[PDB]
Subunit: 216 residues, 6 copies
């Protein structure tokens, strides 16, 4: 990555490389893997971002969908920021293309130059955005269960049902508005008869704390 | 986080990310997880605090109650510190809102600016307070056992009973006044007949050391 | 803790937090846990000392006896160093109370101010002393076996007997004078008949090396 | 390696040495091992590159093919950059040969001199290129399965088939053009009858996301 | 310990504390534990040396013999370097006693003062010498087998016999002169008849390499 | 070791000490242990080199052959660089002897003085050379199998045979000339009849890549 002490390139650490590989091995495309990807790639160059994706041995269908997302974003970058086709000014910073941000057509030195310019051209953060957009599509793709089939079992603790409910909603990537809203509708409709009766009785404007307390 | 050598942003470490994920995996919302959360989030930006919460794959009912606690606190921040609605002074520090402290509407650069201002606007510590208040509600919620059902078994060592007693009291979050007070009342009432007889005999003003020595 | 490079606050490390939690999990209140507590808390602020104690999930009877020891010491600090009750001199160092040393009524900034004053008011070391005094009472409390029941088995190697003997004496916290003295008395009385005969024959002023060599 | 704080030699870390040995033990010449080799050898001298290859205990047929690749590249370096045969200018930088880049005929000091010259003679990066070219030949060699035998099982989830497909294609080292192209041909021909029918129906210009969604 | 960047006190690391505890748990007083003790205590203060010994939970007979060795050495230090009994010169370095070197009567600050004086009074290294002398007595004590009972089995590879032989000799702490000398005498006498015949035939002045090659 | 930030002594790390001990425990005198020894001893003083060898608990026949190799090299150093026998010039650098390089007769301070002189007297690297020469003799000694008994099994994959072949050749320490030469002779003679027929047909000047491809 690029770190302080002034802004300089540092080798990606064995600890970082290993954490990323292990999390994918243990968690595949469970949603929590995305924020972990983001955090492990703090200060990453495009090269570092390619390194972490390349070190993954499985999930090559995901990696191939991911490349499709990156080309779409690359093409929209190029549509928005076309670069003049002439030869570059001797010893001057060339403008980055989509493929330069994705690190397919840029060197580490070019990447350093952009990310440490004043002001920075933050190619690391631009590419991380493309990748995370791509990873989110995959999370949703690999979400195995519709929220509509998350229903509380006759003998299932309400807390365990809410855990499954909100885990499913996270993979299906319903926004926060739909997370706080489902609280007074689908969460209750999908509750078992006993709890549903208690939750109906509470009235509307019940916090999730109040609902969860109410169903024991 | 933000650390010295002057005050600068540092990437959250793989060691830190992994410790937090593991403690939640092993301990869920056992009370000792909260002080561990606090310590692992030493110097954290709002972004870092969101990162540690986001990296958690389970407990999504807790994470959703947590968001409710954060909105209540956000709203009370906004009620107490309203921000002028105008466009910002070029290159000047804007005042943070509830949502800026919770890191939903603030950038890392804004967060750095606040936390490294002279004097600091300590948005990291303000948000950690909201989160810990939220986590404590959850600890109490997930405390499975009333102190009233913690009673010493006929053949249970007094020390093991006191361990269960004070573990339960910690999850139920009785204050220190009620921890030092329960010593001369509920701890004795909940003791087995043999030990209760010994503890009655000691008289009042017996230290817990004295009680525990007295019951072998 | 507080460390050099000048004296500055540093976050307690994940490695430190984890070592302390694990040692308590593996060793409970075996005496060797105390010197390990001391070493893991090198340079600790009162806050850090509370952090390490708070991160412990079990042993809440011990943690509650510990608080009793800390209040006694707090009260003796207050008896010895009363603080004037007036409002503080603007931007000046207030004097610490018992509760400020125990970190219940002091901020991290106050704690830093004291421990980095010239000369230091070493609140970290004052509190570590209180805690270790408290932990030693607990070690002795949780010592399961009187030295008087440590007797060499008919077929037990003398070395294994001496190991049990001096382990017991450590938990029971006999001073060094009583450790070097027990050598020519209780160690011999508690030996098996065969070894006792050999040890009687050696005469007095036999080193433990000489005794252990003598009993094969 | 060579790192900043100015450009200086640093010992290869135990963490780095161990990561490389373990990845080869776990993954042999699975393609993801190459980008991991590249990342673990960030800032490496030729000596460091020889160190990581030498620390490998198995795969000596691979290590011997690797040496053949390195001699071919060494010979092409020498063909392109012949060095004058005279004795060197006292205290001056000699020009590197193939064998000097491969670290068989160069000292660490010479390697440091080249890699830290202004501008650098980047012998570390030149040698890493030779080695990675050699490692890629081996990956392809050790790829056990033709893409032509990757066909979706009657009851095999389309996602699992695509994973095998694109894993195989990676080991066989088909370029990106042939990865994005196989999408509308061999991936579909190799699908099971049910999915093939669905994929035929989609028409051409279907994204892999669209195909994978379409086959459930 | 005391380290450079000028000479300053550093906290003993969790990694160091844990390595020492584990090596004693795994290896007890096998001779290789002593050089490991020495290396783990690089730059140690007397306090650090007491910390590593105190963190050991077993082997309290050894720890008690160790204290006897330390008092003997302390007494010989005092016999050789008596200290004037007067009160100290305000703000001046007092001379260390045996008990000050063993860290029983000295503070960390005093220890720092001595070890960082110009020239250093190297109390860390003086105490490490006493301790290692004490640990060596214990290694020999706990050596279970006389070299005289190390004899090659009828079917035991000569290499395995030599391994047992020289392991035993190390615990029994025969000097290097007696290690290189035993080569042409006891090693051969203790060999099995077949190998003994081969070794007799070699003649004297045979290297251990030559002997080991000769016996297959 | 000795490291930069100017050239200064650093404690050998717990990580380094542990890596070396573990590699010997897992790999004994498999050839790959030597380059790992070299890499773990980067910047080592003679003292550090003795520390790593001393920390090894087994293989005392090897350690004793090793000492014989070190004395031979010590004696050749003394034959080549005799030292004047007079008393040293006050506060001046004495010349090192064989035994000073092997760290038996030199202090750490003397070792630092030599290795940090301008120019350096590189006693660390001189001793590492002696040791590695000694370790290589042992690797060959402990190589269990002649290359002549490495023959491809009727049903053994050619790749697995070549792996055994070149592993054996590495332990037997045939030079690179004999590794690249054995390719067109012994590798083919030792192949099974089927593969031998294919390899004979290829003709001479076949790469190992070509041979391995040819035998499936
Ligand atoms: O090296 C790389 C480059 N890219 C970007 C890319 C984008 C589109 C097409 C090819 C490559 C990548 C994307 C995803 C996984 C791994 C990688 N590995
Ligand atoms: O990213 C985030 C932001 N917040 C604050 C928030 C507060 C209220 C509503 C939405 C978000 C959060 C809170 C809890 C767990 C995870 C997260 N993750
Ligand atoms: O936060 C804390 C504060 N104290 C001191 C205290 C002293 C007396 C009464 C309450 C608190 C403490 C003591 C022991 C274990 C954990 C803690 N945790
Ligand atoms: O030491 C080395 C040197 N080389 C380069 C070399 C190149 C060609 C011939 C001999 C040596 C090497 C290559 C591959 C694996 C290990 C090593 N180990
Ligand atoms: O704290 C200590 C002090 N000493 C030196 C000592 C020397 C003689 C008598 C008492 C103490 C010690 C020696 C050995 C193991 C542990 C320790 N722990
Ligand atoms: O301390 C040491 C010194 N030497 C050199 C030596 C050389 C020859 C004779 C005695 C000692 C050594 C050599 C090999 C293993 C361990 C060690 N340990």
């Amino acid at each position: 990555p690029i770190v302080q002490n002034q802004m300089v390139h540092q080798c990606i650490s064995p600890r970082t490389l290993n954490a990323w590989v292990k999390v994918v091995e243990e968690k595949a495309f469970s949603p929590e893997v995305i924020p972990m990807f983001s955090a492990l790639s703090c200060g990453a160059t495009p090269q570092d971002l390619n390194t972490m994706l390349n070190t993954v041995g499985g999930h090559q269908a995901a990696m191939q969908m991911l490349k499709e997302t990156i080309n779409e974003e690359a093409a929209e970058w190029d549509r928005l920021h076309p670069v003049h086709a002439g030869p570059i000014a001797p010893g001057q910073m060339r403008e980055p293309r989509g493929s330069d941000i994705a690190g397919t057509t840029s060197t580490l030195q070019e990447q350093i130059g952009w990310m440490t310019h004043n002001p920075p051209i933050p190619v690391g953060e631009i590419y991380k955005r493309w990748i995370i957009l791509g990873l989110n599509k995959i999370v949703r793709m690999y979400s195995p269960t519709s929220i509509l089939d998350i229903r509380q079992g006759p003998k299932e603790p309400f807390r365990d049902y809410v855990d499954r409910f909100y885990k499913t909603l996270r993979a299906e990537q319903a926004s926060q508005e739909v997370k706080n809203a489902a609280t007074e509708t689908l969460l209750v409709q999908n509750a078992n008869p006993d709890c549903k009766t208690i939750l109906k009785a509470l009235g509307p404007g019940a916090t999730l704390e109040e609902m969860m307390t109410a169903c024991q």
